[PDB]
Amino acid sequence: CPEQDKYRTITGMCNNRRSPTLGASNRAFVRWLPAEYEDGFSLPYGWTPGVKRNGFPVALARAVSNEIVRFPTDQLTPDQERSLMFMQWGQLLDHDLDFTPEP
Amino acid sequence: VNCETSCVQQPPCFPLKIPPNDPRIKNQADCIPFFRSCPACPGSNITIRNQINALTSFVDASMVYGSEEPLARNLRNMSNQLGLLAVNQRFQDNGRALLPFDNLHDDPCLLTNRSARIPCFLAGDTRSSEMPELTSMHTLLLREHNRLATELKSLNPRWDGERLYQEARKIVGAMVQIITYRDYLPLVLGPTAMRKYLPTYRSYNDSVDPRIANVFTNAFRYGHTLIQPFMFRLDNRYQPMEPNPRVPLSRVFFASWRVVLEGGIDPILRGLMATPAKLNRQNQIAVDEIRERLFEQVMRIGLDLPALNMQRSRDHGLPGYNAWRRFCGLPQPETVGQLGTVLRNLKLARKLMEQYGTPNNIDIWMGGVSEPLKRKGRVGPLLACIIGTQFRKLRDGDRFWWENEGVFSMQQRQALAQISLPRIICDNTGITTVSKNNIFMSNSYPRDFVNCSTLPALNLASWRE
Numbered sequence: 072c073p074e075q076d077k078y079r080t081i082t083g084m085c086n087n088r089r090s091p092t093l094g095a096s097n098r099a100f101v102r103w104l105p106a107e108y109e110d111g112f113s114l115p116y117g118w119t120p121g122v123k124r125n126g127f128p129v130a131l132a133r134a135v136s137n138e139i140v141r142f143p144t145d146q147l148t149p150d151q152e153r154s155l156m157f158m159q160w161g162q163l164l165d166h167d168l169d170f171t172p173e174p
Numbered sequence: 175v176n177c178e179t180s181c182v183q184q185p186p187c188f189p190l191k192i193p194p195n196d197p198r199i200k201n202q203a204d205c206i207p208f209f210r211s212c213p214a215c216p217g218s219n220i221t222i223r224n225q226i227n228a229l230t231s232f233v234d235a236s237m238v239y240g241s242e243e244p245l246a247r248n249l250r251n252m253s254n255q256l257g258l259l260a261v262n263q264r265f266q267d268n269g270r271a272l273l274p275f276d277n278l279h280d281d282p283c284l285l286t287n288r289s290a291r292i293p294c295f296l297a298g299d300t301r302s303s304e305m306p307e308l309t310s311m312h313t314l315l316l317r318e319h320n321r322l323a324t325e326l327k328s329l330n331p332r333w334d335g336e337r338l339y340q341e342a343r344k345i346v347g348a349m350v351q352i353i354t355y356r357d358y359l360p361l362v363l364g365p366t367a368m369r370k371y372l373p374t375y376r377s378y379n380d381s382v383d384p385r386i387a388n389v390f391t392n393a394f395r396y397g398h399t400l401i402q403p404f405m406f407r408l409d410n411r412y413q414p415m416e417p418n419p420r421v422p423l424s425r426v427f428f429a430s431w432r433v434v435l436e437g438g439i440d441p442i443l444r445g446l447m448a449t450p451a452k453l454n455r456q457n458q459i460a461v462d463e464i465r466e467r468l469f470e471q472v473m474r475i476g477l478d479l480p481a482l483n484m485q486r487s488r489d490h491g492l493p494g495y496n497a498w499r500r501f502c503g504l505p506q507p508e509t510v511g512q513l514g515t516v517l518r519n520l521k522l523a524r525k526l527m528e529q530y531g532t533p534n535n536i537d538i539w540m541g542g543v544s545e546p547l548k549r550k551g552r553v554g555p556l557l558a559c560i561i562g563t564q565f566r567k568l569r570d571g572d573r574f575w576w577e578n579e580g581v582f583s584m585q586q587r588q589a590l591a592q593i594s595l596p597r598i599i600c601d602n603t604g605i606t607t608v609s610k611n612n613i614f615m616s617n618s619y620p621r622d623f624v625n626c627s628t629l630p631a632l633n634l635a636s637w638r639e
């Protein structure tokens with residue numbers, strides 16, 4: 072860490088001088104609550120057929136989508152007080168904050 | 175093994191199985207492809223599985239510059255000491271810049287159109303090409319960097335190639351913070367949460383952890399509910415620019431050819447400012463373009479984005495709805511009656527309670543988007559908390575935050591506060607009729623539209639050396 076600095080680093084490194092990898096790139100997400108898994112450490116809920124979550128069976132995301140997210144597109148209520156640019160900046164800002172890499 | 179074509183559940187695959195009597199997939203053996211998120215610790219049985227953020231949590235405009243040193247260089251125009259960002263040397267938008275092209279093996283953009291043979295673009299974020307409306311914002315921000323670099327070069331010709339890039343970068347990131355917290359966030363939270371989770375900024379705090387919370391990644395996907403099933407292209411008179419003025423979203427994903435060979439950024443931005451966003455309603459959550467036809471042009475099957483969000487939250491081992499309500503100090507519904515009261519919709523409470531069994535098991539995005547919106551805000555109290563809590567941390571925990579003492583002068587700060595995204599559109603496009611402040615509210619032409627002259631530009635006089 073340099074004693075005096077005029078600009079930001081490219082990796083976010085050194086923004087916090089005490090914990091220099093805080094907010095920096097290619098580092099683990101902070102957790103605001105402990106993680107919740109089938110085995111308690113790795114396997115996601117839904118993983119093992121049979122295994123229930125908090126006493127209840129694990130609902131398929133596709134089924135939750137089919138039954139709670141689906142509607143006929145012709146019925147779409149347009150927002151009066153919001154532009155499509157509002158939806159668009161959120162994505163642009165999100166892409167400044169997080170990217171969970173996959174294999 | 176190969177999540178892309180295989181429906182077997184061997185790591186790193188976690189494929190989404192098809193339920194009986196599915197509206198689209200009649201093949202039960204088939205499934206939605208899924209690649210588990212990368213572990214911060216591969217193979218360990220001691221650490222509780224966590225995931226990586228490949229980006230700088232900071233509102234520093236890393237989607238412009240890059241969050242990795244090699245990509246920060248292979249994005250700059252190294253041929254001159256004008257410190258600009260490199261551009262497309264093969265294509266232009268009425269003489270104006272276009273983001274450069276990226277060398278890719280498995281290029282998704284090329285599969286949207288064989289005949290055009292237009293690949294993905296190259297920005298500080300791999301997702302720049304995912305949609306032309308996003309390519310538009312990306313193209314605008316790069317243009318505004320070279321535009322600032324030039325306006326600073328003529329002001330201080332005694333400045334080198336590095337100083338120019340850094341000083342325009344500084345200003346860019348600051349404009350991202352200004353539009354985020356002053357314009358975007360109040361219209362996300364509403365006035366109530368905006369005063370609770372984001373009170374008047376005091377000064378930088380080194381004891382505030384500026385990382386992104388594992389939850390924020392799934393929670394901030396609330397925007398999926400604001401998705402319009404078409405890309406809206408508009409002429410210089412804000413009228414349906416033909417051919418293809420309402421192009422279905424399943425034919426716009428990755429289609430980079432639509433920017434280069436179908437009008438450029440200008441018709442996309444006009445249509446962005448003038449078209450209303452989709453309204454999240456308890457019975458109308460997200461569109462079937464993203465729910466049935468996601469990346470349909472580039473994949474063996476179209477994905478279901480709202481479902482991906484849910485499986486992803488399980489992959490990230492996220493605690494359900496009730497855990498987060500508590501985290502936020504909000505009541506925790508335990509039954510359909512209680513949830514009915516929480517959601518202010520018993521029909522939804524019953525449908526969710528049928529799927530989940532208890533609201534404890536309700537996947538964070540599912541429960542967050544199901545909640546009724548705040549006053550003047552586009553989320554309920556749970557997402558307002560998660561989102562708000564995170565943005566508080568990214569502001570007070572940012573040592574290069576625009577308002578912080580030393581980043582900019584008393585003078586530059588005065589200059590910077592005059593900036594707005596319409597003004598950014600005025601200077602980087604051939605668009606003259608612009609969204610009258612607030613850009614994110616304004617959605618009807620000409621009722622909420624003004625001219626480029628009626629907007630003050632950013633004075634870079636305080637920047638002189």
Ligand code: HEM
Nearest residue numbers: 158161162165169170171305391394395397398482483486
């Ligand atoms: C263009 C329309 C959009 C599409 C097609 C889209 C698509 C996606 C997809 C496919 C993912 C990864 C899904 C997964 O496999 O887990 C994703 C993640 C994400 N999206 Fe969206 N999205 C869009 C708009 C937005 C909007 C409007 C927002 C918020 C304002 C947003 C916020 C997020 C966030 C936070 C993530 C996780 C990012 C990460 O860390 O990797 N998205 N989106």
Ligand SMILES: Cn1ccc(-c2cccc(COc3cc(N)nc4nn[nH]c34)c2)n1
Nearest residue numbers: 162165169170171172173300301302303304
């Ligand atoms: C290096 N590399 C690995 C994967 C990619 C890549 C590039 C463009 C789009 C996509 C899929 O689409 C999204 C993924 C995501 N994690 N978040 C998003 N938000 N909107 N769309 C999103 C993945 N690049």
Ligand SMILES: [Ca+2]
Nearest residue numbers: 167230232236
């Ligand atoms: Ca960043």
Ligand SMILES: [Cl-]
Nearest residue numbers: 262263274275
């Ligand atoms: Cl190029």
